[PDB]
Amino acid sequence: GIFGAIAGFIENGWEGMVDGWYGFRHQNSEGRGQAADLKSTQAAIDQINGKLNRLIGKTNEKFHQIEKEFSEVEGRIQDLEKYVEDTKIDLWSYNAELLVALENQHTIDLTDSEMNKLFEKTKKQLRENAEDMGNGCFKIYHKCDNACIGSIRNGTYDHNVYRDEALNNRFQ
Amino acid sequence: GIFGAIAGFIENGWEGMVDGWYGFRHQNSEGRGQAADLKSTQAAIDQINGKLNRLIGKTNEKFHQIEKEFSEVEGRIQDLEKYVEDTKIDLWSYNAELLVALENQHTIDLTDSEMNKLFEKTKKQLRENAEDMGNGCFKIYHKCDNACIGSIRNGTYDHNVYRDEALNNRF
Amino acid sequence: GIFGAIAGFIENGWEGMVDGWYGFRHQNSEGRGQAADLKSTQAAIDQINGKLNRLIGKTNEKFHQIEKEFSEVEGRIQDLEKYVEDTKIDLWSYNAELLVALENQHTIDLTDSEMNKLFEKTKKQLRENAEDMGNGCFKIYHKCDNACIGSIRNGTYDHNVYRDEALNNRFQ
Amino acid sequence: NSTATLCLGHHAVPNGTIVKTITNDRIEVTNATELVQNSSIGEICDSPHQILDGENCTLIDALLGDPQCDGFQNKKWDLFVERSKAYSNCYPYDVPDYASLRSLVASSGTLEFNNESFNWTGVTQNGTSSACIRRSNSSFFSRLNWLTHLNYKYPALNVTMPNNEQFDKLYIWGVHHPGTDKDQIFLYAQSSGRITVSTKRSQQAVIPNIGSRPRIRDIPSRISIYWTIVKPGDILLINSTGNLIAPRGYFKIRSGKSSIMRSDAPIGKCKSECITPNGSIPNDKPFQNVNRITYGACPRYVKQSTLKLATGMRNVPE
Amino acid sequence: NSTATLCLGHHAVPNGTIVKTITNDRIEVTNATELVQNSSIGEICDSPHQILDGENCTLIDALLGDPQCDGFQNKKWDLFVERSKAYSNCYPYDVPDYASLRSLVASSGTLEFNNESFNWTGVTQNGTSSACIRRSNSSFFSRLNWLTHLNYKYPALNVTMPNNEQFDKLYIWGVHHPGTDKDQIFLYAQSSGRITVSTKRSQQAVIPNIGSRPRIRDIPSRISIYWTIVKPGDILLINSTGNLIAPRGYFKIRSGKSSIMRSDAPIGKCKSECITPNGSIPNDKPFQNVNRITYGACPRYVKQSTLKLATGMRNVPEK
Amino acid sequence: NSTATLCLGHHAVPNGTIVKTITNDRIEVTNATELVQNSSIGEICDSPHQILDGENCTLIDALLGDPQCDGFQNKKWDLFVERSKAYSNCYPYDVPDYASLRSLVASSGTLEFNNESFNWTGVTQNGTSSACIRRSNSSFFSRLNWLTHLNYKYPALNVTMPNNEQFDKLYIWGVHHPGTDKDQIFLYAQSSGRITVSTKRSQQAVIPNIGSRPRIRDIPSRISIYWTIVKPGDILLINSTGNLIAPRGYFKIRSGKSSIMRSDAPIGKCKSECITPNGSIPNDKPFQNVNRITYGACPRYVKQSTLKLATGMRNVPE
Ligand SMILES: *[C@@H]1O[C@H](CO)[C@@H](O[C@@H]2O[C@H](CO)[C@@H](O[C@@H]3O[C@H](CO[C@H]4O[C@H](CO)[C@@H](O)[C@H](O)[C@@H]4O)[C@@H](O)[C@H](O[C@H]4O[C@H](CO)[C@@H](O)[C@H](O)[C@@H]4O)[C@@H]3O)[C@H](O)[C@H]2NC(C)=O)[C@H](O)[C@H]1NC(C)=O
Ligand SMILES: *[C@@H]1O[C@H](CO)[C@@H](O[C@@H]2O[C@H](CO)[C@@H](O[C@@H]3O[C@H](CO[C@H]4O[C@H](CO)[C@@H](O)[C@H](O)[C@@H]4O)[C@@H](O)[C@H](O[C@H]4O[C@H](CO)[C@@H](O)[C@H](O)[C@@H]4O)[C@@H]3O)[C@H](O)[C@H]2NC(C)=O)[C@H](O)[C@H]1NC(C)=O
Ligand SMILES: *[C@@H]1O[C@H](CO)[C@@H](O[C@@H]2O[C@H](CO)[C@@H](O[C@@H]3O[C@H](CO)[C@@H](O)[C@H](O[C@H]4O[C@H](CO)[C@@H](O)[C@H](O)[C@@H]4O)[C@@H]3O)[C@H](O)[C@H]2NC(C)=O)[C@H](O)[C@H]1NC(C)=O
Ligand SMILES: *[C@@H]1O[C@H](CO)[C@@H](O[C@@H]2O[C@H](CO)[C@@H](O[C@@H]3O[C@H](CO)[C@@H](O)[C@H](O[C@H]4O[C@H](CO)[C@@H](O)[C@H](O)[C@@H]4O)[C@@H]3O)[C@H](O)[C@H]2NC(C)=O)[C@H](O)[C@H]1NC(C)=O
Ligand SMILES: *[C@@H]1O[C@H](CO)[C@@H](O[C@@H]2O[C@H](CO)[C@@H](O[C@@H]3O[C@H](CO[C@H]4O[C@H](CO)[C@@H](O)[C@H](O)[C@@H]4O)[C@@H](O)[C@H](O)[C@@H]3O)[C@H](O)[C@H]2NC(C)=O)[C@H](O)[C@H]1NC(C)=O
Ligand SMILES: *[C@@H]1O[C@H](CO)[C@@H](O[C@@H]2O[C@H](CO)[C@@H](O[C@@H]3O[C@H](CO[C@H]4O[C@H](CO)[C@@H](O)[C@H](O)[C@@H]4O)[C@@H](O)[C@H](O)[C@@H]3O)[C@H](O)[C@H]2NC(C)=O)[C@H](O)[C@H]1NC(C)=O
Ligand SMILES: *[C@@H]1O[C@H](CO)[C@@H](O[C@@H]2O[C@H](CO)[C@@H](O[C@@H]3O[C@H](CO)[C@@H](O)[C@H](O)[C@@H]3O)[C@H](O)[C@H]2NC(C)=O)[C@H](O)[C@H]1NC(C)=O
Ligand SMILES: *[C@@H]1O[C@H](CO)[C@@H](O[C@@H]2O[C@H](CO)[C@@H](O[C@@H]3O[C@H](CO)[C@@H](O)[C@H](O)[C@@H]3O)[C@H](O)[C@H]2NC(C)=O)[C@H](O)[C@H]1NC(C)=O
Ligand SMILES: *[C@@H]1O[C@H](CO)[C@@H](O)[C@H](O)[C@H]1NC(C)=O
Ligand SMILES: *[C@@H]1O[C@H](CO)[C@@H](O)[C@H](O)[C@H]1NC(C)=O
Ligand SMILES: *[C@@H]1O[C@H](CO)[C@@H](O)[C@H](O)[C@H]1NC(C)=O
Ligand SMILES: *[C@@H]1O[C@H](CO)[C@@H](O)[C@H](O)[C@H]1NC(C)=O
Ligand SMILES: *[C@@H]1O[C@H](CO)[C@@H](O)[C@H](O)[C@H]1NC(C)=O
Ligand SMILES: *[C@@H]1O[C@H](CO)[C@@H](O)[C@H](O)[C@H]1NC(C)=O
Ligand SMILES: *[C@@H]1O[C@H](CO)[C@@H](O)[C@H](O)[C@H]1NC(C)=O
Ligand SMILES: *[C@@H]1O[C@H](CO)[C@@H](O)[C@H](O)[C@H]1NC(C)=O
Ligand SMILES: *[C@@H]1O[C@H](CO)[C@@H](O)[C@H](O)[C@H]1NC(C)=O
Ligand SMILES: *[C@@H]1O[C@H](CO)[C@@H](O)[C@H](O)[C@H]1NC(C)=O
Ligand SMILES: *[C@@H]1O[C@H](CO)[C@@H](O)[C@H](O)[C@H]1NC(C)=O
């Protein structure tokens, strides 16, 4: 949430967004529609997967160790063995909690980066033919059918095609 | 400094901003003034308070531990006890140091985030009626009283009513 | 890549720049050239040096410790002495591994941030006199001699002098 | 119209999952996974680690030769499992540094006895008592030789045995402590004795102590078990004036992945790197909350019941 | 055609504090809190933990029955505080595993003696010495019994004390090492007296060494103290011929939050759940620099004296 | 035209370095530095620390006074180096808690023997053996005195030595175990001779065991080495009836940066704050991968071989 994307200008998530994690919802004369961006979704999923692989699958082997439970009280030796195991468990317990907290905050923030990256990519694509209202939506000041919305999503938008109509609709 | 707002384009702290952490200082017809943003400030305190709550939390309750100070010199078993306590102390000191450094860096960046977020929200609100100089200040090309400043500060700002006037002034 | 500049809209790095980490490449009527921004480069280098000065040079002194190599199998005491050292090694190895991963992550993010900060600084300096192409380059809608590019790179660019010409080239 | 709208957004799910962050204790994300192991199978797996079950026998008792443990002769293991139902039905024994011997034999992972030939001239070998009931009549620890007076005499014993083999040998011997002076006279025909087990680098000397002790299997007398390790190029020497319970040869020692675990869980047919007293557990999660005692490739023990790692973005509803 | 300006900014403070981050050693922020407790109030609070002050007595001395430690009889504690002024005013003694006994009794947290009547037949009881002076007369350890010969004949001893009351018993006992042979005959009427204290699971045999020792309180003889623990359903068997310092009963051992700490700080009136040898400390910070010895809910010890966490933003001054 | 293009770019290197992040296991960056030391010069540096080699002499032998170890007398060290090519030729000796005494003297870092005159009246001093050949002639441990009978009689010894110096005294004494009873009578004129060394806070009592043991240098007997520490304001009392290997003086014990290490590595003349058994290593990096045993200002050993830290940006070449 350091960019304010998921909990910022985009106030709500879409549950019908089942084909991906980030997507485009357009409204035009041809109705509405909802499509998925897989570059942003995968650019996230790979990142958390890379984390998961750094965490999951790595395992140590300990064969012979010290005694950890006792039946008769002995004294200094038994107390020393208890202390060593207690300090080991507590230190790794701290390492686990700090690991989860740090990685979860990074997970939220990296998804924040991906959502903001998608917004920046679209905004730089639209140039002077569209304006942002601060809710994650763009006002397209030229008539855009489903084809040119798909041109936005597919990256093949020539801003020079509709520049004049959009500018006339923006300033007049 | 990662967002480049607190030490970046807004390279100035207002000591007169005693009410909040972030906010707006304006100059228009009817004079100059200073106010605070309460949502962004509260967000920063909430994150810091969450850090503080996670810090102490539950404190380890240990009752009977090994001996750590010795009067006579005994040999292997005493050296073992000293080495165990040294290793535990050094490991916890390192955890202390890394936590302080990382969290302090996170605090610096979270504060820079909330500033840039407030700046982005205010830009998105002003739409095409205003322009950005590059110092955390916006030039508004429509006459704004001491009232529409509050509109910008509180979300109740419509760019469509000043749109023609600001556009004509801009060009 | 939390800002999407290094691996994003600026998708190509320049091996021709050897006097700085970040810089400018201009094309005008006088030709084309390349320069470097020493300030942003210095900022990133200083942050990295601060990481090194927190890590490299910090030595801990230990003189008398427990034995860590035993020639005859003793049993309980020998097993305990082996266990404490193995536990210490494992914990410090995890600390080292988490450190390098986190530091490399922050280093990549900070370098991305420095690049993004330079981009936004140039954008706000150029104001409405230029527009963003979405690849890290700016289209200047007015005549810039080599001193004009120098004025953008030195910090002494006045947009109010070229504003009328740029606006006429933009919206007409 | 002359106007189109294009909104940018993210996904959300109703099956949210609350996880922990640095700045928040309760944040809802779309998908999350578990990092701590909370449940076991409950039973130990025969694979891949060789599991030997002592049932009614301890590792020391099998090393000594309690008749019910005679089935463990020549046996090896990757991990010895000791049960709560273990009990002894031989001479009342005591091992100083019992934990050291237990760990030493466990790290060895082998109970390999090859019998050797001491001369033991002038004494009667193969002593027996009415507690170590092997076959149906009376016997002793199969691994220990009890020496008593021959022709009512106990000539001084000075025996040697070199280690001409390139493996370190482990010797288990003992001292007998009669409960009465009348007993000590009956067994050894002498008034007390001494035993000295020596190597070219180590020396141990034991004194029998005659006194009344709580009778286990009607035996007020005790025996104390000690061990000696003889390396190649060294010689084991036994110098006894009486009351010596002699070794019958040498146990082989090894260094390897072997250990010992105390558990009362069953033994199952499965493959699992991780073995715990509570049972074998999967080793996919990085941490566990089953037991601080683990064997093999295992997740590390932590004190927290759950550690959820977020695998998705923050979950905001519609 | 009017224009307006609206600036966005943050707050700042006159001087502020200095913290450290990943990238810089020194950085000025508006506000920060301390994470390391560098001080102590100077006194040990008597709450919420139970504090017993040995003053001039040690834990083992109160366990044995030193004539200055009879006030600690049948006393429980959560934390036993031993001062660097305690001394012994009884027969010179030497416990071969002293630390293990002290840790055992500290973890037990109780000094609870229930007396048992042993069938000491043929031996004179309640021996006395001039080093141990209870009240104003020669005495011995209260929990210890010194047996001498009766009619110049020390008979054999075979005494059995089972445990059927369903709690573990800690038995104290000792072996007297006389400084002279003449002392050995004078008290025990034998050349040398063997000692064997055994249970169904453990046995202990002690042989006394007769010879001169450095004189403490003008006594050249010494006494070795041993401890034996008997489980419920087990019998204690003592079999001896002389030189026996007999138990007078059984000490109770429990499993609790109890321990022992060495300090010379007064037991002041307050409530703090963390006790330190330098004095009690407050558990408001995650870490501390007072002492490595802790009791209770205590902040974890680190070597660093100062560790600040910023509770505010970067402080950019107006000037 | 009225158009200009100003691009913002970053620098790239022809050949970068691969580093590891929490997110990517392999990412290319411009500059990187190593954080784990995996090399050594193969030498131990006698600066800034004070290094004492042991050659053929162990620390215990130098403390006792082995004839080849006489060059170590009255010498100090910050670190003592023990080589595998260490042999002892004085007399077969066994030290109960050998490791503890080794740590004792190592931590002291000094062998400063000050001589004292005990009574030793009625007994013959300066006993010699043929296994301890010093100066082409039979001798004994330099710091230990062997006490024999005089006029075919061994009087009872009761010797007191007070400590008035404002430091602690460390005493090393021994007890003789003859291989045969005829040896015991020949040396000490008594069947069995007890030893009791006591202070005001300690008492060490030893009864020797007569018995043949494996012969080293044709010596079937063993001497058992014990140490007693007398604090300022205490006395050392020696009470014996024979079989005494008495001290010739006291060793001064001290606290400091002193310790011992085993290393078959040369000591050239360099400077390194860190010393390891494989040879002194630099301490620039925060971690090392050469050995777990370290002395001085040393990097911390880790299991990992190479850990890389990014000193530059991500590399995207053209
Ligand atoms: C470790 O091992 C050594 C070597 O075996 C033992 O040393 C032996 O100890 C015994 C008893 O102390 C000795 O036995 C004695 O022998 C005397 C005669 O010895 C000569 O003749 C024999 C052959 O018969 C030769 O081997 C020997 O070298 C001599 O030339 C006897 O006269 C003694 O008799 C006494 O005891 C018996 C037993 O009760 C009585 O009936 C007699 O009346 C008399 O009191 C005695 O039997 C033996 O000689 C020693 N061997 C040696 C020195 O080589 C150690 O005892 C053994 N243990 C220890 C702890 O060291
Ligand atoms: C209990 O049982 C043990 C059995 O292990 C006996 O120990 C053995 O005792 C015998 C002697 O009785 C030892 O044998 C002798 O070893 C000597 C070793 O000397 C070394 O040093 C000299 C130089 O000082 C070298 O020259 C030599 O090579 C060795 O390196 C030999 O020198 C002896 O040989 C000489 O004497 C014999 C006997 O007269 C002659 O036949 C030879 O020709 C030569 O002149 C002899 O070999 C044996 O080493 C011991 N073994 C161990 C493992 O220590 C105990 O003695 C016995 N105890 C009793 C009975 O009480
Ligand atoms: C542990 O206790 C047992 C006793 O339970 C002890 O063993 C011996 O037990 C017997 C009786 O069970 C003790 O009694 C002796 O009996 C004989 C008769 O057989 C008497 O002769 C003995 O002495 C009498 O005669 C002597 C010579 O005339 C006199 O000097 C003496 O005063 C008596 O008149 C004696 O009564 C026997 O005493 C003990 N043994 C010893 C050594 O005392 C066993 O010893 C105890 N444990 C240990 C470690 O010793
Ligand atoms: C430690 O030092 C002390 C003090 O020196 C020492 O105590 C002494 O012990 C010896 C041996 O027990 C005592 O000497 C004996 O005393 C008796 C009684 O006076 C004598 O009868 C003895 O005579 C011997 O010689 C006779 C003639 O050959 C023999 O017939 C007889 O059997 C004896 O062998 C002998 O002198 C001595 O009195 C005490 N000193 C005292 C009590 O002050 C002790 O032995 C030393 N060692 C140890 C391990 O404690
Ligand atoms: C072995 O040698 C030992 C050498 O010390 C002998 O010990 C000494 O034995 C004599 C008796 O022969 C004792 O003498 C008496 O001591 C008392 C104690 O008072 C002194 O000590 C106190 C301590 O605080 C001090 O405050 C006093 O001022 C005295 O200095 C005196 O009151 C008597 O008058 C008499 O001198 C020694 O005290 C004693 N010393 C030690 C250290 O033990 C030992 O007896 C010998 N063993 C034998 C011969 O078997
Ligand atoms: C510094 O000096 C150290 C000591 O000389 C060096 O330690 C050596 O490190 C190498 C590489 O790791 C080891 O070589 C491997 O060791 C393993 C372990 O097997 C041993 O342990 C098992 C225990 O069950 C035992 O059963 C085996 O018989 C072995 O004794 C072997 O499996 C491999 O095949 C391979 O040999 C050396 O063993 C080790 N030497 C020791 C510990 O003495 C260290 O590498 C040096 N560092 C440098 C030069 O940078
Ligand atoms: C010293 O005191 C102990 C404890 O009182 C005595 O031990 C007891 O000795 C008697 C025999 O004298 C034992 O009776 C026998 O028990 C067995 C097993 O039940 C039974 O099969 C026999 O027929 C006989 O009844 C008794 O069990 C035993 N008690 C204990 C707790 O060990 C000891 O006898 C006394 N004297 C000596 C010299 O040890
Ligand atoms: C028992 O053996 C010891 C150790 O060898 C003897 O002490 C040593 O005695 C010699 C003289 O006999 C000392 O050497 C000389 O010292 C004097 C005075 O410093 C000096 O002027 C000479 O040039 C020569 O160096 C030697 O230092 C000394 N060693 C010590 C005290 O450690 C002792 O005399 C022998 N006792 C008997 C009764 O044989
Ligand atoms: C756009 O890309 C989608 C796949 O993401 C494809 O199905 C569609 O045909 C493309 N349309 C155009 C106009 O490129
Ligand atoms: C700005 O660029 C011009 C290039 O003509 C140069 O003269 C001037 O020095 C630059 N500004 C600064 C502050 O150096
Ligand atoms: C083990 O002992 C139990 C009694 O506790 C018995 O039921 C079982 O058959 C024994 N198993 C053996 C001897 O294998
Ligand atoms: C010891 O045993 C060997 C076995 O071959 C035998 O030859 C030798 O005579 C025996 N020695 C004695 C003294 O019995
Ligand atoms: C004692 O048992 C061993 C076991 O192998 C046997 O070889 C020997 O003959 C037996 N001795 C007897 C029965 O006297
Ligand atoms: C010793 O004192 C105890 C204290 O209760 C008493 O029961 C016993 O009878 C005394 N023994 C005597 C005076 O012989
Ligand atoms: C606490 O006391 C110890 C000695 O008992 C001392 O070393 C340490 O510096 C003290 N810590 C303080 C006063 O913070
Ligand atoms: C990388 O940084 C190190 C820092 O010491 C420097 O020595 C080295 O020259 C740098 N490499 C490059 C290619 O800049
Ligand atoms: C060590 O022994 C060797 C022979 O084994 C010899 O050459 C060398 O000089 C000896 N070194 C010392 C210091 O005595
Ligand atoms: C100790 O030496 C003194 C002085 O020579 C002597 O009078 C005394 O008898 C000696 N102590 C003995 C022999 O026990
Ligand atoms: C030293 O040994 C030689 C051996 O040849 C011997 O002749 C000489 O007498 C011995 N030294 C003395 C002082 O006796």
PDB file of C-alpha atoms in Angstrom, chain D residues 98-182:
ATOM      1  CA  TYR D  98      24.620 -43.851  31.456  1.00  0.00           C
ATOM      2  CA  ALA D  99      23.646 -41.063  29.054  1.00  0.00           C
ATOM      3  CA  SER D 100      27.183 -40.966  27.636  1.00  0.00           C
ATOM      4  CA  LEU D 101      27.146 -44.704  26.911  1.00  0.00           C
ATOM      5  CA  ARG D 102      23.619 -44.478  25.485  1.00  0.00           C
ATOM      6  CA  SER D 103      24.565 -41.628  23.143  1.00  0.00           C
ATOM      7  CA  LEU D 104      27.841 -43.347  22.218  1.00  0.00           C
ATOM      8  CA  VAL D 105      26.107 -46.585  21.205  1.00  0.00           C
ATOM      9  CA  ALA D 106      23.342 -44.654  19.430  1.00  0.00           C
ATOM     10  CA  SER D 107      25.723 -42.526  17.358  1.00  0.00           C
ATOM     11  CA  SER D 108      27.465 -45.822  16.612  1.00  0.00           C
ATOM     12  CA  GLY D 109      24.238 -47.225  15.187  1.00  0.00           C
ATOM     13  CA  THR D 110      25.539 -50.789  15.409  1.00  0.00           C
ATOM     14  CA  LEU D 111      25.353 -53.579  17.973  1.00  0.00           C
ATOM     15  CA  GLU D 112      28.035 -55.817  16.465  1.00  0.00           C
ATOM     16  CA  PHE D 113      29.676 -58.154  18.963  1.00  0.00           C
ATOM     17  CA  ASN D 114      32.567 -60.389  17.945  1.00  0.00           C
ATOM     18  CA  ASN D 115      33.737 -62.612  20.781  1.00  0.00           C
ATOM     19  CA  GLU D 116      37.382 -62.600  21.847  1.00  0.00           C
ATOM     20  CA  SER D 117      39.569 -65.037  23.768  1.00  0.00           C
ATOM     21  CA  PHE D 118      40.769 -63.965  27.190  1.00  0.00           C
ATOM     22  CA  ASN D 119      42.770 -66.589  29.052  1.00  0.00           C
ATOM     23  CA  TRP D 120      40.946 -66.182  32.410  1.00  0.00           C
ATOM     24  CA  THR D 121      43.152 -68.850  33.957  1.00  0.00           C
ATOM     25  CA  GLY D 122      42.368 -69.988  37.492  1.00  0.00           C
ATOM     26  CA  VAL D 123      38.723 -68.848  37.570  1.00  0.00           C
ATOM     27  CA  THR D 124      35.329 -70.234  36.585  1.00  0.00           C
ATOM     28  CA  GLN D 125      33.749 -68.542  33.576  1.00  0.00           C
ATOM     29  CA  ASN D 126      30.041 -68.212  32.714  1.00  0.00           C
ATOM     30  CA  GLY D 127      28.624 -67.187  36.065  1.00  0.00           C
ATOM     31  CA  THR D 128      24.856 -67.349  36.484  1.00  0.00           C
ATOM     32  CA  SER D 129      22.188 -65.867  38.750  1.00  0.00           C
ATOM     33  CA  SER D 130      18.500 -66.467  39.471  1.00  0.00           C
ATOM     34  CA  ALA D 131      17.432 -63.202  37.802  1.00  0.00           C
ATOM     35  CA  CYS D 132      18.920 -63.436  34.284  1.00  0.00           C
ATOM     36  CA  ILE D 133      16.776 -66.414  33.289  1.00  0.00           C
ATOM     37  CA  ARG D 134      17.771 -67.308  29.734  1.00  0.00           C
ATOM     38  CA  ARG D 135      16.511 -70.572  28.257  1.00  0.00           C
ATOM     39  CA  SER D 136      14.736 -71.875  31.377  1.00  0.00           C
ATOM     40  CA  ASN D 137      17.632 -72.258  33.834  1.00  0.00           C
ATOM     41  CA  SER D 138      19.829 -69.458  35.195  1.00  0.00           C
ATOM     42  CA  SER D 139      22.186 -67.365  33.070  1.00  0.00           C
ATOM     43  CA  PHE D 140      23.742 -63.885  32.937  1.00  0.00           C
ATOM     44  CA  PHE D 141      24.228 -61.048  30.473  1.00  0.00           C
ATOM     45  CA  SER D 142      25.146 -62.805  27.228  1.00  0.00           C
ATOM     46  CA  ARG D 143      27.760 -60.099  26.570  1.00  0.00           C
ATOM     47  CA  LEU D 144      29.389 -60.309  30.031  1.00  0.00           C
ATOM     48  CA  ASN D 145      31.452 -63.050  31.681  1.00  0.00           C
ATOM     49  CA  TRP D 146      31.084 -63.526  35.444  1.00  0.00           C
ATOM     50  CA  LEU D 147      34.222 -64.870  37.129  1.00  0.00           C
ATOM     51  CA  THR D 148      34.168 -66.767  40.435  1.00  0.00           C
ATOM     52  CA  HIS D 149      36.649 -68.811  42.456  1.00  0.00           C
ATOM     53  CA  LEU D 150      38.051 -71.976  40.871  1.00  0.00           C
ATOM     54  CA  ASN D 151      39.034 -74.572  43.488  1.00  0.00           C
ATOM     55  CA  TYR D 152      38.189 -71.895  46.084  1.00  0.00           C
ATOM     56  CA  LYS D 153      40.960 -69.615  44.813  1.00  0.00           C
ATOM     57  CA  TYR D 154      40.958 -66.401  42.768  1.00  0.00           C
ATOM     58  CA  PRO D 155      44.454 -65.967  41.305  1.00  0.00           C
ATOM     59  CA  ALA D 156      45.297 -62.449  40.192  1.00  0.00           C
ATOM     60  CA  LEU D 157      44.215 -61.752  36.615  1.00  0.00           C
ATOM     61  CA  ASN D 158      46.495 -59.888  34.184  1.00  0.00           C
ATOM     62  CA  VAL D 159      45.201 -60.335  30.636  1.00  0.00           C
ATOM     63  CA  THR D 160      46.090 -58.487  27.448  1.00  0.00           C
ATOM     64  CA  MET D 161      44.409 -58.060  24.095  1.00  0.00           C
ATOM     65  CA  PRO D 162      45.828 -55.865  21.326  1.00  0.00           C
ATOM     66  CA  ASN D 163      43.843 -53.861  18.793  1.00  0.00           C
ATOM     67  CA  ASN D 164      45.475 -55.117  15.599  1.00  0.00           C
ATOM     68  CA  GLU D 165      42.394 -54.066  13.590  1.00  0.00           C
ATOM     69  CA  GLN D 166      41.899 -50.681  11.885  1.00  0.00           C
ATOM     70  CA  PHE D 167      38.535 -50.118  13.623  1.00  0.00           C
ATOM     71  CA  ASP D 168      38.271 -48.767  17.150  1.00  0.00           C
ATOM     72  CA  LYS D 169      36.881 -51.427  19.476  1.00  0.00           C
ATOM     73  CA  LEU D 170      34.432 -50.810  22.311  1.00  0.00           C
ATOM     74  CA  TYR D 171      34.657 -52.955  25.446  1.00  0.00           C
ATOM     75  CA  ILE D 172      31.882 -53.245  28.031  1.00  0.00           C
ATOM     76  CA  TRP D 173      33.005 -54.607  31.399  1.00  0.00           C
ATOM     77  CA  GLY D 174      31.879 -54.234  34.982  1.00  0.00           C
ATOM     78  CA  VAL D 175      32.480 -54.536  38.702  1.00  0.00           C
ATOM     79  CA  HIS D 176      30.388 -56.691  41.029  1.00  0.00           C
ATOM     80  CA  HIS D 177      29.304 -55.304  44.408  1.00  0.00           C
ATOM     81  CA  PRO D 178      28.138 -58.102  46.739  1.00  0.00           C
ATOM     82  CA  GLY D 179      25.513 -57.183  49.302  1.00  0.00           C
ATOM     83  CA  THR D 180      27.307 -58.964  52.153  1.00  0.00           C
ATOM     84  CA  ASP D 181      30.847 -59.901  53.114  1.00  0.00           C
ATOM     85  CA  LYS D 182      29.644 -63.510  53.288  1.00  0.00           C
TER      86      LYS D 182
END
